[PDB]
Amino acid sequence: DVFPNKFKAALAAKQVQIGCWSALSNPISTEVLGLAGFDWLVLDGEHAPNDISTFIPQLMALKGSASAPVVRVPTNEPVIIKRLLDIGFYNFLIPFVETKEEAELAVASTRYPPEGIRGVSVSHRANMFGTVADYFAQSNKNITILVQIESQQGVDNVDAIAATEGVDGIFVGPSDLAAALGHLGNASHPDVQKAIQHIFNRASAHGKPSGILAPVEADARRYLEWGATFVAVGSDLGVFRSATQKLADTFKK
Amino acid sequence: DVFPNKFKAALAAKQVQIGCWSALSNPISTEVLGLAGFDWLVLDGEHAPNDISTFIPQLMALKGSASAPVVRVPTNEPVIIKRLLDIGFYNFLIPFVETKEEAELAVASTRYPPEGIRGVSVSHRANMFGTVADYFAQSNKNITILVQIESQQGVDNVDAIAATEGVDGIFVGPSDLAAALGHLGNASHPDVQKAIQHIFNRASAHGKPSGILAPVEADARRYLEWGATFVAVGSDLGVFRSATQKLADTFKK
């Protein structure tokens, strides 16, 4: 069925999950993206022009795809999380999780009371309009929470955050983290690299898997060796941009 | 014209208002829905994939319909209420109203200062681009506020909330209330039923009409006898789901 969340389970068994970012915000290219074979695709709702109106068509486009659909909320607040849970998202990427407090809110937003604060609707895409067996009971256990550590504060509290019940994975937002460490546009800086591995280290420390976005293969391969399990190796936008540009160059120079 | 708000008046005279929920989020089916004859249709902006972009087409679809269009905001905050008032909504359903404070904010968001905090625009669907006579003066008296009591806190303060100036009706969100009372997916529980009637009782106590959503006819008929006036007897989604499924079954078993 919809449950159990196989993606959430792969993360638990700390298996390597290869993902790709999506920002093209449309069902046509996203259906093609789902054929690639990635383990998870992040439908970016924060840095990509995506909203409820584009999320649903794309989620339909991904039906029958092995890739686990993950939504990256525009911010960590309960209302949007609620709306995103009902339209059919079972995995979440929460930008800028700086405290254990925030980490809990995020988890609570994906859970029906008393376990959480999720609002209850009786018919929607999540429970496929009432066709999902034992929905209410199951739902609260089949939602993946991926918190992004991309601020100094988030780093300082990485340990508490990773220990939080519900937090299924620790994700590192390199670009934001680099800017946060006074190295905007320079994540490769040894300063950023040390902060990145630290987060990984602590993630592993609390049994939670770590993850990161890294369109550069070398970095991707380095992070995987550092232990990271859910790693995004690129984005539809990026590969499309490079591939097309490259194609033009091999004929025009 | 647009004023006076006849729906707001029916509620005041505590007449029985039979409504239906809408979640299909589109102008085509919603135009058909408007032919049914319901007294009010709730265009759900909280648990249904609806937004400004879908609300307007549907509001146009409902033009010439007896049904009073009611928008169920995604949450109780001034900005979205403001935007929803300008596109042409004169009746509001406010989710999770737990305190008299919140109840006031909600009312204040639908009123131009000093009476409230509503932002002023000079041409929009609300004043039909300047063709509504004495708009500014009238507007502040023709907006229906329906607060949802669906939390324990909301219950505890039902009395204060119902006494609030502006609050035109007390609505009970069964599912959320049930989850709030430790009975997720079991609103029929005598515990929930007692909390429901209590809210009704208090609504009546302060001269304000009470309301509820109940797709099951028996419950609907029971709540009406308990006194509830604005009752939603179903949703486009639900009747569509049952009707279609049923149709398939009478031929395939």
Added chain:
Amino acid sequence: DVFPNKFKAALAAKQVQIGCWSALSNPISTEVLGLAGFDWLVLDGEHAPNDISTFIPQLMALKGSASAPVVRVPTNEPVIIKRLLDIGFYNFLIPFVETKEEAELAVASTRYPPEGIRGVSVSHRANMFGTVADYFAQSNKNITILVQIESQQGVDNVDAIAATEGVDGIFVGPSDLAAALGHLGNASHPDVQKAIQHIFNRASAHGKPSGILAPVEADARRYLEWGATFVAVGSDLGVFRSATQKLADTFKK
């Protein structure tokens, strides 16, 4: 997988196929429709505001559904059929098939040279962008063609039409045949019924299953009793319309 076309197979085996019409023209309701369990759903591109931009979302909404998607082209002409083939439709309903040549044209429009005149593209939804095995070869033998006999001339040539290689099923258009016989709005007329019966015998006469649209149950059972195998027992529009009117009535009457 895409191939073989099970719907095409079932028809050939003359087993009863229970379908529903679709005019709501939107992914949200059609996804809910796909849950009903019909053996086939007709995305009407002739009398409903559907087109390529509404078809893809609805086709995606039906992914996973047991229902076989069937598109009713606005008219029998190569170009639109060409385009509809590539967006993912494997089953077609052709309106106003009046002669053997037109029937031929329809079949040809769905097959690659030299079997037919279908245009060639290498990547589209039909072959799921190069993932469907032996696409070219298999596609030509996996397209269901359902012709509509809904006119005087269509009846006169019913035998020639039914004997055409590629015509997988003879469909009767009650409203249009009735009008063709000077009985607009009265399909139940003896003259009309007689023709429907005739088309069915001539269809069975050539070992081709017969079909028709019967929104009224008593008629659906009558036609099935006569031996029609693929019968549409209603439409999402008519069901939604009727069910919402009924719900309103039981409480406002």
Added chain:
Amino acid sequence: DVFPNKFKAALAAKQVQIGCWSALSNPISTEVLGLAGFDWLVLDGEHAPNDISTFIPQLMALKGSASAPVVRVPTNEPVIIKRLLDIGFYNFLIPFVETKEEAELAVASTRYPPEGIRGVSVSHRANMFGTVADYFAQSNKNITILVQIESQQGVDNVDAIAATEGVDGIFVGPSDLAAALGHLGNASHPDVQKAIQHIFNRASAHGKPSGILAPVEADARRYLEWGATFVAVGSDLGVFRSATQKLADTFKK
């Protein structure tokens, strides 16, 4: 109500009908347009990016407006007319009507058998999903057909075209007639004016009102002075374009 068609009646009575063209192709501005007070608005499907997906929202936007909606089909052919009839258009403008047969074809395209070849559907916007009384019967006598004489051949056959049963008004296409006479961009040319005058007399000659599009006031008054009854005095596009240019100029010049 839908029937009788008041616009159709007014024309027959040769009373002046003042209209405006629409090319903006969107519900928002067209709703504002519907407030102006024109007796008729032309939703151009020939030279504006309009189509069935933009028509329904705009048709809904015009509900309540005193303006009679008129659709300008992209071309004179049965199928598109069939589809446009069902989405809610009761008035049509046919481009390039050059012969009596074509004029005939147009009328026939809007009438059910045996009067015409219009396809039959039982539920759509035209009959407001089964709510319009005696729809079939009344529809055939309530469709306004406005033919455009904008070509040499159209002028030669103006009398035959005007005498056709069903042709409710003769419309002149200034830009196209001008081009047909070798005067592209110069409709004010004596040769062109002469033909416009001629078409008007031949129209009046058969008791059929005449019409034309005159964005320039002096021309509008001239044509009205000549006796044209349904005159389009401009377009939303031209007005918006001109008014915004003027506003910019008065402050930046």
Added chain:
Amino acid sequence: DVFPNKFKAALAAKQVQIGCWSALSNPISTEVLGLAGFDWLVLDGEHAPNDISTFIPQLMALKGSASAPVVRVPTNEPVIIKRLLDIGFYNFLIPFVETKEEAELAVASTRYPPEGIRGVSVSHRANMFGTVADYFAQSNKNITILVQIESQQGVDNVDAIAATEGVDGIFVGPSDLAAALGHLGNASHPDVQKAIQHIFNRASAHGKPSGILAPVEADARRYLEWGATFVAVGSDLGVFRSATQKLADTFKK
């Protein structure tokens, strides 16, 4: 390139910037609007049905237009500002800026740390998917911040707000300010007029240019003489409304 922000520079040199408001929320009319010649066009995201989904098409429509695109956020909060910066907005109008605090938040939301709190994305419309030279460094200096003073509190602190680093212009929202001063719908009241000039006075006092919206020419000309530099002389909606209505009247009276 994209940088340097010429509009931001014109404001600095306190040149007269003639702008127009946009609320029609669509690419078709907005492309025409861009031909008018205004120095800046405010794509209203607060009182007009605009969102990310409509903003992008319109921004593309404005490409190659002299007009500087300005977005009027729905409210002053970092998340939406972030999303609006990535889709391609370089100039912002911030509604209801009442304190120096708020003024700073607004500026900080448009700046990458440490200078601000802007979230970092590597490929988007702002840096044209990586083709803008020295983006990160440049961006933080090429973003225009226009704060709206339209409350009593905002007035009381006009001085502190105008002195804030980042604030590029002081804009007066007449309608809201009037309502704020107990004169809803009467901005011409000497009370409002005195508050307006005060704001202007203080804007100039801190070297920052002042601005205002005034569809009435007299007021527009008066404010310009009072010193205001960035003045919106109308809106697409308003000129469209007046122009169309006027056109109908010159022919029907």
Added chain:
Amino acid sequence: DVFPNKFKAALAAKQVQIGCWSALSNPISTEVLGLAGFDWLVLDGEHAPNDISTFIPQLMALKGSASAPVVRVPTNEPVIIKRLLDIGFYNFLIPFVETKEEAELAVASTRYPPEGIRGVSVSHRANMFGTVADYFAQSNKNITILVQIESQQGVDNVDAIAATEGVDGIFVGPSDLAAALGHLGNASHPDVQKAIQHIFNRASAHGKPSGILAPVEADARRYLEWGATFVAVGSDLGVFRSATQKLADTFKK
């Protein structure tokens, strides 16, 4: 400016034009595509889900791009060409041009009387709503017509087709020509290659540049080696598909 048509000029000068196909049907990715640097991009309206509603946004997305936008009409017929001309397309690709008459029809469809049969409108994207100088005059001599020889009959008449006044370039459709020769899926077949070579010589024979679609590099170089000037070296779809599959593979294999 719009005129002269530089792409039309380059072709006439037989200089190499490097293009890419577009089927993604959306403004977001097409804007990124426009950055690649191709001399021309084909917005496919024949084998991709593109149409007037997707074309305008994409056309706007290409404003500023050095790439010349080319539209591939669904089929060679006056009406669709008429409409596509007005929305802003100056370059056309005509599928299945089999005879000299059809080639003629295509050219005529793009020119105003008496040169052709193009319909006349005074304000649209083509003349940028009356801003393009001497539009009527210049437009007729600035429309690029690229005909596709992709059928047996098209090859037989290649010389007559190439000698037609207005035919700016002979394009070969590999997939369709191959099917026409009984080599579906095998364009590399000697029989097919022979015809492609032939069409190229007959094209060069009449001083008309030749073109073709070659997604595989080795073929692109081969055809360019043979002297083809306008060659499409791929499609956004194929590139995106291939690049995303590759990225997934390098980490999951």
